[PDB]
Amino acid sequence: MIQKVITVNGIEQNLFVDAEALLSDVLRQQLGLTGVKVGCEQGQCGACSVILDGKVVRACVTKMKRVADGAQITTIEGVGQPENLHPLQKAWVLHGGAQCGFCSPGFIVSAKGLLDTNADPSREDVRDWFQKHRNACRCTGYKPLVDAVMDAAAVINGKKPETDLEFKMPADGRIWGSKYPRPTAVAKVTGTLDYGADLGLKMPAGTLHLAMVQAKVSHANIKGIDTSEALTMPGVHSVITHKDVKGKNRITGLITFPTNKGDGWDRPILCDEKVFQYGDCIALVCADSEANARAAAEKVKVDLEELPAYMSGPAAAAEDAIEIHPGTPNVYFEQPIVKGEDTGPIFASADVTVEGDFYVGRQPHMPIEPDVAFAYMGDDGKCYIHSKSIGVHLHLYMIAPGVGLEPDQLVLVANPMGGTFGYKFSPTSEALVAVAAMATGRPVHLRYNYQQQQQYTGKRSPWEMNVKFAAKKDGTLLAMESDWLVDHGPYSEFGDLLTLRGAQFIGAGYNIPNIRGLGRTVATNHVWGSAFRGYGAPQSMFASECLMDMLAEKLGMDPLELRYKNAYRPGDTNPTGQEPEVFSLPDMIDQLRPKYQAALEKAQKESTATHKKGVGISIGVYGSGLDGPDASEAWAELNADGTITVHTAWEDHGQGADIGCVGTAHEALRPMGVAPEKIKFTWPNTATTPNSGPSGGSRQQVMTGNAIRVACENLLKACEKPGGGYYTYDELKAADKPTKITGNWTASGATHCDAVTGLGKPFVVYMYGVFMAEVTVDVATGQTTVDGMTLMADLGSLCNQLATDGQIYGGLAQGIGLALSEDFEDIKKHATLVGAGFPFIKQIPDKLDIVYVNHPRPDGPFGASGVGELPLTSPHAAIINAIKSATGVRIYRLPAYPEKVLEALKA
Amino acid sequence: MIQKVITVNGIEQNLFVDAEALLSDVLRQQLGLTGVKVGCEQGQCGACSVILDGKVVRACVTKMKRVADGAQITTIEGVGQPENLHPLQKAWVLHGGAQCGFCSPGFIVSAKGLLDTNADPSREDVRDWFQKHRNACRCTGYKPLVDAVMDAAAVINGKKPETDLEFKMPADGRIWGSKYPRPTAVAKVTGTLDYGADLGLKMPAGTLHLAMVQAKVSHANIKGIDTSEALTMPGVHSVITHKDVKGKNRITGLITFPTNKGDGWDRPILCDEKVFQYGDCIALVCADSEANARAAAEKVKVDLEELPAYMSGPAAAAEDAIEIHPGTPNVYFEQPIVKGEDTGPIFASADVTVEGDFYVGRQPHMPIEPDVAFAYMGDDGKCYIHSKSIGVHLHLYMIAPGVGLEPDQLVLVANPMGGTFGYKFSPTSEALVAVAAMATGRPVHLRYNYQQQQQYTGKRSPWEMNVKFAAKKDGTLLAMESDWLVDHGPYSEFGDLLTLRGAQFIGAGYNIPNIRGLGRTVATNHVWGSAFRGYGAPQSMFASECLMDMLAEKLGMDPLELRYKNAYRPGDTNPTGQEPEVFSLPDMIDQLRPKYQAALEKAQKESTATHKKGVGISIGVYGSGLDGPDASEAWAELNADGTITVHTAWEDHGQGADIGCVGTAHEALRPMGVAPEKIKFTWPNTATTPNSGPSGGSRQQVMTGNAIRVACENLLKACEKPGGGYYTYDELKAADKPTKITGNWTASGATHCDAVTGLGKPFVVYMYGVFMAEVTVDVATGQTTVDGMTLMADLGSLCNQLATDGQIYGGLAQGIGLALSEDFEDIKKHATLVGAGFPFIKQIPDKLDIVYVNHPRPDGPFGASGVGELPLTSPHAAIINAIKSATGVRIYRLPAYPEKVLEALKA
């Protein structure tokens, strides 16, 4: 050990440290500076950025031996605090740069380092700086972060007054549609919002820290578990196995389709008879620290009989394949789509036909914050779980039978969380922590490292697809045929539903009267499927939007004009036979057209012999809702202090559940003149908030926004005074009148898609958009650079523009990754951010352009649709179409790795 | 466990707690708010004061179940921070209210609570508030704290501008003699100075926490130790016993007098053959937490043969008594005093003689911070100890042979510390933590609780005394006889030296030509003797100053006038035959006289039948130095940034080592125009600071102040430019000239007192004072209230008036405790603050008056003497003399408990 006397955030610290200890651990654990966020732990994400003697360093890869006596360190806590915000923090809030907020401290500290060395950076200087310092963001697409740095710099430079970094209320007083900052922003930009790992550090002594004993093969029969060496190791309390589970030790898919061949009870909590994928949790070590638990987990010995593993859909679907779940065929679900007339004769007599085979793979979510959860037994006898769940009520029912609790004896709460992008539509760690809390009686905390986040959370499910179009010479679509095979890994939850998405979205955007297709879901031993932003659309629409360009090529037609010819207009129906609710695609195409033509001309002018430029188009469509007559509930309550609490379980991945609540409520409450800062939101809790439903399917703004609107309308009625005006809390309580008022809303016009035909009216609101990608391909290396993305978006009406702009930029960036760099195929190589192709700032163009072409929705609150998943529906198709425009080569199987593009260029 | 969402220091906290947990632990350990100080842990000291929902509460006795959802908590961190100080914090700094600083956060938070309820309190309102809220201070005597509250209130009320709470530099630029604030004040008032327990919380995981296995009988032969049950208990690493000690397992007294009958090696580190007092440490449990170590220590079984214990000096000194240290007589030292002619014949022929038997007991130091230390093995192979040592070099040599290290392989460092008042002139925990660090190889931390602070740190040693005076009718003293028996408990360190103090100080202040006396030191089984502020003078001068009043009474002379007749004047010598260096007692008496006469008249006028008022006088004298030719060393270094570091081992109990250094250096550096904020001090460290010596004997201002002066004079010479002016650092380094310059100083005129006669010149500088106490005695209950104290003080020249005023107020308050309420006689009953008679604010009068009558010392730096121990030399004699004045009764044996006074009143 060594004494080091240094200054941290301007205050002398008399530190006692191991010279080999990591600065991140010292700052977070010894000094309580949990504003230093840790994600990857490998120097790749920048979340742990601190200033050390004028240099921005990653604290997770800086050992204390590198910190000199008398060193100066600054963390986010030294940049500024609530009510003493630095210009960078104020700018972040104003520009909406904190979505999940997990990267915000690190970007802000890094930016202070930049501005201390270059007071007047260009936007490119800012981008170069964040590239060099490895500041990674998965939510924002980087543009808002650069915007914030530039604004702060202007203020620090005296070019602009600091008051201009503070939001100015619009003249109309309306926050609906405005850039009003989100309530959680201040906490996020000051490092004072506690995420799950932060909470772990602040839990009491005697909290047990868990480590997973995980399968290191992909498929096996388990013969035994020996914990004897582990029990002797430092700090170890006990080891938990399936024998300690008090219920069924299975997670239920809950809404497993009747025509699924499996019962939906396939997924264990702790493996008992079998390993089904690499990473499966076989045991939990409980210890006094994460470090001691992990060390001991390495000594637990599992005796396995390894089995041949099926690592792709086609392998597992072979007629000869051995059943992974004995008694259930590996191909456990099929969904037909049968619209209109038989397609065979139409293809035979059509002027033109096209066909393609396409692939979209196992995209990894890559939030900056790896999975983390904790649980404890309450003083009331219930088991409490606090996690990254984005469907607390859903997950309660998925896990309660398995853990052996009745639903009223378990409570799930959503912690503040650093992104999910859908992986948390699935249970991950909740059942594990519940079992351990129940077995020990003690609080327990489980933090995944980044390798576990990659290997042992669910993934976008790969689809192998064949799609065909028949059309007239004038471009009018006549018929479509489709086939898709969904590799869902070993756990069935929502796999049938994901497969149904192919019937709904392959070919969406156009009038196609005649469709014959079939989706099939297959169990494999690769990573299990969890929702990933777009949930079936990125697969489906990659195929159909690439195939539209192939059709245009075969006709000698411009691909934007081919889309214009076929786009939904009154009278048309979507693939499930339902009429669209608004018709904005022609409007959006007409408004895009001159920008597309100019982009084509620029690409022609600026292309060189070696660097070929191209422009690509695609359409995106997706539902806002879960299928059928989805519903939500909210409670609007006048509090004694005159504030109003809007109680919901609107789960916040980081997308803006807080501001969606406040903005929607504000608009609904305008007759009573309620200031936005007087409106409070509630963190999701299954005991004390209503069943608003999960934040999946881009649904909350529509479903919960409507429930909030109704609850607020009902509160206004409850407060109305005879003769005009409104009663105060005191007046209502004195008259023994209610102050907490319910509202509910149901999408009553919706119906589930049929099991035989796929036809129905699954959503009452959809999101519609048109993408344009501008790219450059280096034909010597095959490397593609995306120079610009544009989204024409019809969101009906904006609840909050900081929220929607940010959602779109973030989705576009994930689309660039999906197109060019991302996959989870190689269990070890793709288990790091850099290994799996995470998009760092230079991969995302500064030119991300949005044009809102909003057609108010009949059933949306104040006309709103969702936004969340729209920007990932097909940006990757636009990008691949742009590579084709540039070079003549078509990549059918994502991602467009440089060598793959080169091979195609040279064939 | 329960989730509680509350606000702490204005920030929402999502807390997870045990409902039974103490708020102090939650705030300090879970939230890192080490500004909440914990001392007593029993709700008696107020150090842990926090504001909870507008009420000031003691966090150490507030369980989390009392903290409601939505509660608001404020700690010192929420009051203000460095560079954002609250008016109360600024006022504390300006008024010098932070000496050790350990109580400062709690008083400030408590005061904010006061001012939030009563914006314009009277001084009595402030006192009533601190009484009610149990805010205890052992350093300041409370008056400076009340001063600070009143000043802050005026500012908060708009009656006075906030800028007036900031120090204004004197016109002359001189900080010597000024009220310049001490460097450490800001950290203390903001809770950002880490004391030893705070450091423990900020040490790395894998630091082991120690608990002592202690004797629960006073005297025994040890037969065995069974650790078997303890080793099985939660979190336990190991148990350390004497078998793990690598050296002699004894602490050496180091400077044991040759005529001592013992070898000075009597004190074990870990008991091996015997228990010598209740509380002796027999083993150390090492565990993952203090709580787990303590729980396991309760299960360690010690097999003992209890022996009869001698619990007082007279019992142990009986001719028949069994030797506690076999081979050494219990009476192990005698010091004669033989001055002038044989006293028998002088007593026989004198006009008047008086005699008395007096007792001063086992006063407990009662710092607000209980003892704490830690140790580790450095990367350099040395063993480092960080403790409350106020003599780091001294303690290194006292313990190194016992722990089995050569002196260069051990390093002792003084942590910031919450008071000692001399107990840390002794080793307490240093050898214990060293043994454990060496045995385990791991960092180790040991915190005493308040019961252990009381039972198992050293104490003022009781003296049983008989003193006699012979005098002429006109009051001229002719001769003195003295006998004293010093109960030193079982451990000899500095016991012989303490006994020699009786030869030096019994009768000090007056010309007494003929003296015959004898002091004897005896080992007992009550608590071992450690220095307590005044170190022999409080005992010695209680006897002689009470006896002077008895002489005055027998002569029918006024007791101030009797002192005036006899006080040192040129030509006189002190009891050791040495001439005083200055002669200020007559001056001080002349200046006190009219205030004494007015006080007498007030007492006469204001006395009633039931409440009798009186006025008492005493003189105090004490040396500044350790005996003989004491010395110190300092290094003055010009740093590259133009600051100057003054390197010393001036140990800070809280008295002001920081400001003594800065003020003395500033004065010495004035020719070069060095601003005070440019002068840095060094925390004591045996490896990297010079052997400046211990902060004992009121010596540092004289010894180390002179060394600092010399080092600074030498730095000026090193920086002088030919032709006038001074070179910069850059100019000196370029010329390859030295920048770090030594200075030393020795009290060359001093000699040790003779072993046969007691004569010598032990100190070259003394401190001189005259006390006046004003009291009221309720003759129905025997309760005495001290209504006022005055000290006429000759300190030569003031380095810093905030420091000296505070030292005097603090010493006067300890004198009130010594006189009226304090003892450590009953091992259990006196093991709490309240049980042992700690003076809370209402026991200390707001009227504490100082008059400086400074006679510059020939050998002091800029004329300064010490101050530290002067105010405790005899205030308790003045108080007892005032009780006699008021009521006619004399208390001979302290303390003057009400029942004791009543018994005397009624006899």
Ligand code: FES
């Ligand atoms: S770079 Fe440190 S946590 Fe990712």
Ligand code: FES
């Ligand atoms: S806001 Fe950047 S990772 Fe979420």
Ligand code: FES
């Ligand atoms: S009153 Fe809480 S530590 Fe003393």
Ligand code: FES
């Ligand atoms: S300053 Fe109050 S206890 Fe030391």
Ligand SMILES: [Cl-]
């Ligand atoms: Cl057909």
Ligand SMILES: [Cl-]
């Ligand atoms: Cl391909």
Ligand SMILES: [Cl-]
């Ligand atoms: Cl490649």
Ligand SMILES: [Cl-]
């Ligand atoms: Cl004699």
Ligand SMILES: [Cl-]
């Ligand atoms: Cl008495």
Ligand SMILES: [Cl-]
């Ligand atoms: Cl009493």
Ligand SMILES: [Mg+2]
């Ligand atoms: Mg500022």
Ligand SMILES: [Mg+2]
């Ligand atoms: Mg038509």
Ligand SMILES: [Mg+2]
């Ligand atoms: Mg190749």
Ligand SMILES: [Mg+2]
């Ligand atoms: Mg202020």
Ligand SMILES: [Mg+2]
């Ligand atoms: Mg004389």
Ligand SMILES: [Mg+2]
């Ligand atoms: Mg009695």
